[PDB]
Amino acid sequence: DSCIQFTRHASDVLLNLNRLRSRDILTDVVIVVSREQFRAHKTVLMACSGLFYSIFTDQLKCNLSVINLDPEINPEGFCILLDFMYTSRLNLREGNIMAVMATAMYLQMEHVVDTCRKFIKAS
Amino acid sequence: DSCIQFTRHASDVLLNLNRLRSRDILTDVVIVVSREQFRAHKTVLMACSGLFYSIFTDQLKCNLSVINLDPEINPEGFCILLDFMYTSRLNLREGNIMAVMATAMYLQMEHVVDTCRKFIKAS
Amino acid sequence: WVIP
Amino acid sequence: WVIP
Ligand SMILES: CN(C)c1ncc(Cl)c(Nc2ccc3c(c2)CC(=O)N3)n1
Ligand SMILES: CN(C)c1ncc(Cl)c(Nc2ccc3c(c2)CC(=O)N3)n1
Ligand SMILES: [Cl-]
Ligand SMILES: [Cl-]
């Protein structure tokens, strides 16, 4: 086409979606990870994760307001990944990289799994 | 912080949100523009438009599944702007620039209003 | 704004 | 991935 493009548009959209999350505006699901609860927008979870994409395209699970993750999933690893979904920023540290990679593999977040594998290989 | 960043994350998120829109997945509102109907995600509309942000943060309008725009709003201008919201791409043409600018001013999409003003000034 |  |  003959379209023009606004370079910062996608980043600005994501920034506003994170502002909505921080204010708990139009969040439509709670992700339960052991004792911890995380509120989010199903569409953003689907856009970032192969696991959530599969869950919320399911004709029955699409209507659930609560999703319980596998008890092996670490709440901090999930929190770091949820922050990444809404910001593009990953808080990858020596102390959390194993839990982050395992959570990213479960959530099917291929690019995060790739950088964790590379950072582990370097050490 | 000590975060790393995935450059393409915001663009990939927006691409997936547009895929959900194209398949009518988890759309939660219909925007009525004269005789025309447009399905969308309230969160994406809010993230892109000062008008939708104000509408869906309203304690009563947040729960509406149908929003009717001012009858002066042109459906094609709205369609072009809705496509821009989900893609960062604006189909700005000689034949539509006046309707696009007027719709962007009504929707409070400041960056679109700015490029329309500049393109009009050049001609 | 750019030409993509 | 980059250092933002
Ligand atoms: C694959 N597909 C057509 C599609 N459409 C819409 C959405 Cl929201 C979606 N999201 C999704 C699926 C798989 C994966 C991701 C997002 C991230 C990832 O690493 N794998 N995937
Ligand atoms: C202003 N603010 C705190 C905020 N938080 C969340 C959202 Cl979704 C939001 N969106 C929004 C508001 C105003 C405008 C836009 C989006 C685009 C624009 O030109 N004006 N604005
Ligand atoms: Cl990823
Ligand atoms: Cl804009």
Side-chain angles (χ1 to χ4, degrees), chain A residues 1-35 37-58 60-92 94-109 111-120 122-123, chain B residues 1-35 37-58 60-92 94-109 111-120 122-123, chain C, chain D:
Chain A
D1 219 294
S2 58
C3 288
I4 56 172
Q5 181 176 266
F6 191 68
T7 303
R8 295 296 289 165
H9 181 74
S11 180
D12 289 349
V13 164
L14 195 66
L15 187 68
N16 284 337
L17 292 174
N18 197 30
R19 285 168 174 166
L20 296 181
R21 180 175 67 120
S22 76
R23 289 173 67 194
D24 197 41
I25 296 168
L26 280 171
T27 52
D28 53 9
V29 75
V30 67
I31 308 305
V32 182
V33 193
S34 299
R35 293 186 184 260
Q37 287 185 24
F38 301 89
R39 294 206 49 90
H41 301 101
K42 285 170 188 185
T43 56
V44 177
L45 296 182
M46 296 164 85
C48 299
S49 157
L51 184 71
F52 289 126
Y53 168 66
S54 289
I55 292 164
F56 303 121
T57 51
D58 181 84
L60 275 179
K61 302 184 189 72
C62 66
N63 295 137
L64 296 173
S65 61
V66 180
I67 299 297
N68 307 300
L69 302 193
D70 188 287
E72 209 82 70
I73 304 305
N74 175 253
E76 193 193 22
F78 184 78
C79 187
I80 285 156
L81 289 173
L82 183 62
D83 284 341
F84 168 75
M85 294 188 197
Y86 280 86
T87 64
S88 307
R89 301 168 61 88
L90 188 73
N91 182 28
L92 200 57
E94 186 181 56
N96 69 29
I97 188 157
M98 297 313 287
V100 171
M101 188 171 73
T103 311
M105 284 169 67
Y106 169 76
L107 294 181
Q108 302 166 32
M109 298 174 68
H111 295 298
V112 173
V113 178
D114 185 57
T115 198
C116 288
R117 284 210 256 261
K118 280 162 167 68
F119 275 46
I120 290 155
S123 286
Chain B
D1 219 294
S2 58
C3 288
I4 56 172
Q5 181 176 266
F6 191 68
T7 303
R8 295 296 289 165
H9 181 74
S11 180
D12 289 349
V13 164
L14 195 66
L15 187 68
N16 284 337
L17 292 174
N18 197 30
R19 285 168 174 166
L20 296 181
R21 180 175 67 120
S22 76
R23 289 173 67 194
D24 197 41
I25 296 168
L26 280 171
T27 52
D28 53 9
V29 75
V30 67
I31 308 305
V32 182
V33 193
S34 299
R35 293 186 184 260
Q37 287 185 24
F38 301 89
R39 294 206 49 90
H41 301 101
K42 285 170 188 185
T43 56
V44 177
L45 296 182
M46 296 164 85
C48 299
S49 157
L51 184 71
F52 289 126
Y53 168 66
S54 289
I55 292 164
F56 303 121
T57 51
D58 181 84
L60 275 179
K61 302 184 189 72
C62 66
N63 295 137
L64 296 173
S65 61
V66 180
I67 299 297
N68 307 300
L69 302 193
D70 188 287
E72 209 82 70
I73 304 305
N74 175 253
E76 193 193 22
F78 184 78
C79 187
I80 285 156
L81 289 173
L82 183 62
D83 284 341
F84 168 75
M85 294 188 197
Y86 280 86
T87 64
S88 307
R89 301 168 61 88
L90 188 73
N91 182 28
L92 200 57
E94 186 181 56
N96 69 29
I97 188 157
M98 297 313 287
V100 171
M101 188 171 73
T103 311
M105 284 169 67
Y106 169 76
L107 294 181
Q108 302 166 32
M109 298 174 68
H111 295 298
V112 173
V113 178
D114 185 57
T115 198
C116 288
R117 284 210 256 261
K118 280 162 167 68
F119 275 46
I120 290 155
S123 286
Chain C
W1 295 81
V2 302
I3 303 301
Chain D
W1 295 81
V2 302
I3 303 301

PDB file of all heavy atoms in Angstrom, chain A residues 48 84 109-113, chain B residues 6 9, chain D residues 1, ligand 3, unseen atoms left out:
ATOM      1  N   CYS A  48       1.226 -12.346  23.778  1.00  0.00           N
ATOM      2  CA  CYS A  48       2.590 -12.612  24.259  1.00  0.00           C
ATOM      3  C   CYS A  48       2.937 -14.054  24.482  1.00  0.00           C
ATOM      4  O   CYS A  48       4.122 -14.368  24.604  1.00  0.00           O
ATOM      5  CB  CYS A  48       2.831 -11.828  25.546  1.00  0.00           C
ATOM      6  SG  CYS A  48       2.689 -10.036  25.363  1.00  0.00           S
ATOM      7  N   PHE A  84       7.327  -8.147  31.496  1.00  0.00           N
ATOM      8  CA  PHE A  84       7.899  -8.161  30.137  1.00  0.00           C
ATOM      9  C   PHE A  84       6.798  -8.052  29.086  1.00  0.00           C
ATOM     10  O   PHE A  84       6.921  -7.293  28.119  1.00  0.00           O
ATOM     11  CB  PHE A  84       8.770  -9.431  29.910  1.00  0.00           C
ATOM     12  CG  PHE A  84       9.123  -9.623  28.452  1.00  0.00           C
ATOM     13  CD1 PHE A  84      10.088  -8.826  27.842  1.00  0.00           C
ATOM     14  CD2 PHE A  84       8.432 -10.543  27.667  1.00  0.00           C
ATOM     15  CE1 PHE A  84      10.351  -8.941  26.473  1.00  0.00           C
ATOM     16  CE2 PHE A  84       8.707 -10.670  26.298  1.00  0.00           C
ATOM     17  CZ  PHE A  84       9.682  -9.882  25.718  1.00  0.00           C
ATOM     18  N   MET A 109       6.857 -18.600  25.360  1.00  0.00           N
ATOM     19  CA  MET A 109       7.341 -17.264  25.021  1.00  0.00           C
ATOM     20  C   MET A 109       8.738 -17.490  24.457  1.00  0.00           C
ATOM     21  O   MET A 109       9.751 -17.428  25.169  1.00  0.00           O
ATOM     22  CB  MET A 109       7.327 -16.368  26.270  1.00  0.00           C
ATOM     23  CG  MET A 109       5.910 -16.185  26.839  1.00  0.00           C
ATOM     24  SD  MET A 109       5.892 -15.282  28.403  1.00  0.00           S
ATOM     25  CE  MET A 109       6.422 -13.606  27.845  1.00  0.00           C
ATOM     26  N   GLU A 110       8.763 -17.851  23.169  1.00  0.00           N
ATOM     27  CA  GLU A 110       9.951 -18.294  22.432  1.00  0.00           C
ATOM     28  C   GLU A 110      11.146 -17.362  22.494  1.00  0.00           C
ATOM     29  O   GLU A 110      12.258 -17.855  22.667  1.00  0.00           O
ATOM     30  CB  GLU A 110       9.601 -18.604  20.970  1.00  0.00           C
ATOM     31  CG  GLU A 110       8.715 -19.827  20.820  1.00  0.00           C
ATOM     32  N   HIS A 111      10.946 -16.042  22.337  1.00  0.00           N
ATOM     33  CA  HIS A 111      12.063 -15.094  22.367  1.00  0.00           C
ATOM     34  C   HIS A 111      12.718 -15.014  23.747  1.00  0.00           C
ATOM     35  O   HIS A 111      13.943 -14.911  23.825  1.00  0.00           O
ATOM     36  CB  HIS A 111      11.645 -13.715  21.835  1.00  0.00           C
ATOM     37  CG  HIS A 111      11.283 -13.738  20.382  1.00  0.00           C
ATOM     38  ND1 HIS A 111      12.206 -14.096  19.415  1.00  0.00           N
ATOM     39  CD2 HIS A 111      10.124 -13.399  19.774  1.00  0.00           C
ATOM     40  CE1 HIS A 111      11.568 -14.008  18.259  1.00  0.00           C
ATOM     41  NE2 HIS A 111      10.314 -13.597  18.424  1.00  0.00           N
ATOM     42  N   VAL A 112      11.909 -15.099  24.827  1.00  0.00           N
ATOM     43  CA  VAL A 112      12.438 -15.104  26.204  1.00  0.00           C
ATOM     44  C   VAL A 112      13.234 -16.399  26.433  1.00  0.00           C
ATOM     45  O   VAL A 112      14.351 -16.349  26.957  1.00  0.00           O
ATOM     46  CB  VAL A 112      11.347 -14.891  27.286  1.00  0.00           C
ATOM     47  CG1 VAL A 112      11.930 -15.085  28.691  1.00  0.00           C
ATOM     48  CG2 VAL A 112      10.735 -13.494  27.157  1.00  0.00           C
ATOM     49  N   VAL A 113      12.686 -17.549  26.004  1.00  0.00           N
ATOM     50  CA  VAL A 113      13.399 -18.836  26.148  1.00  0.00           C
ATOM     51  C   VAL A 113      14.788 -18.758  25.475  1.00  0.00           C
ATOM     52  O   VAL A 113      15.789 -19.135  26.096  1.00  0.00           O
ATOM     53  CB  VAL A 113      12.564 -20.030  25.619  1.00  0.00           C
ATOM     54  CG1 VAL A 113      13.349 -21.345  25.723  1.00  0.00           C
ATOM     55  CG2 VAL A 113      11.239 -20.137  26.358  1.00  0.00           C
TER      56      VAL A 113
ATOM     57  N   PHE B   6      13.512  -6.474  24.366  1.00  0.00           N
ATOM     58  CA  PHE B   6      13.285  -7.085  23.059  1.00  0.00           C
ATOM     59  C   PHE B   6      12.658  -6.032  22.142  1.00  0.00           C
ATOM     60  O   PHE B   6      11.484  -5.674  22.294  1.00  0.00           O
ATOM     61  CB  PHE B   6      12.435  -8.375  23.165  1.00  0.00           C
ATOM     62  CG  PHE B   6      12.416  -9.169  21.880  1.00  0.00           C
ATOM     63  CD1 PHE B   6      13.568  -9.798  21.410  1.00  0.00           C
ATOM     64  CD2 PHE B   6      11.248  -9.283  21.131  1.00  0.00           C
ATOM     65  CE1 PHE B   6      13.555 -10.514  20.205  1.00  0.00           C
ATOM     66  CE2 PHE B   6      11.240  -9.980  19.918  1.00  0.00           C
ATOM     67  CZ  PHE B   6      12.389 -10.592  19.463  1.00  0.00           C
ATOM     68  N   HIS B   9       9.208  -6.520  20.452  1.00  0.00           N
ATOM     69  CA  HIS B   9       8.086  -6.978  21.282  1.00  0.00           C
ATOM     70  C   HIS B   9       6.789  -6.185  21.082  1.00  0.00           C
ATOM     71  O   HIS B   9       5.737  -6.806  20.859  1.00  0.00           O
ATOM     72  CB  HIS B   9       8.469  -7.029  22.777  1.00  0.00           C
ATOM     73  CG  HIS B   9       7.354  -7.525  23.643  1.00  0.00           C
ATOM     74  ND1 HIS B   9       6.996  -8.863  23.657  1.00  0.00           N
ATOM     75  CD2 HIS B   9       6.540  -6.844  24.481  1.00  0.00           C
ATOM     76  CE1 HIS B   9       5.982  -8.955  24.502  1.00  0.00           C
ATOM     77  NE2 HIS B   9       5.677  -7.764  25.030  1.00  0.00           N
TER      78      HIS B   9
ATOM     79  N   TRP D   1      17.587  -8.553  21.265  1.00  0.00           N
ATOM     80  CA  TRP D   1      17.617  -8.022  22.627  1.00  0.00           C
ATOM     81  C   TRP D   1      18.713  -6.954  22.745  1.00  0.00           C
ATOM     82  O   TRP D   1      19.800  -7.125  22.187  1.00  0.00           O
ATOM     83  CB  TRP D   1      17.853  -9.152  23.651  1.00  0.00           C
ATOM     84  CG  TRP D   1      16.722 -10.142  23.707  1.00  0.00           C
ATOM     85  CD1 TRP D   1      16.502 -11.181  22.853  1.00  0.00           C
ATOM     86  CD2 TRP D   1      15.617 -10.136  24.624  1.00  0.00           C
ATOM     87  NE1 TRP D   1      15.337 -11.834  23.192  1.00  0.00           N
ATOM     88  CE2 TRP D   1      14.797 -11.239  24.301  1.00  0.00           C
ATOM     89  CE3 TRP D   1      15.241  -9.307  25.695  1.00  0.00           C
ATOM     90  CZ2 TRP D   1      13.621 -11.533  25.005  1.00  0.00           C
ATOM     91  CZ3 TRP D   1      14.093  -9.619  26.412  1.00  0.00           C
ATOM     92  CH2 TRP D   1      13.304 -10.726  26.072  1.00  0.00           C
TER      93      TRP D   1
HETATM   94 CL    CL E   3       8.698 -13.788  23.872  1.00  0.00          CL
END
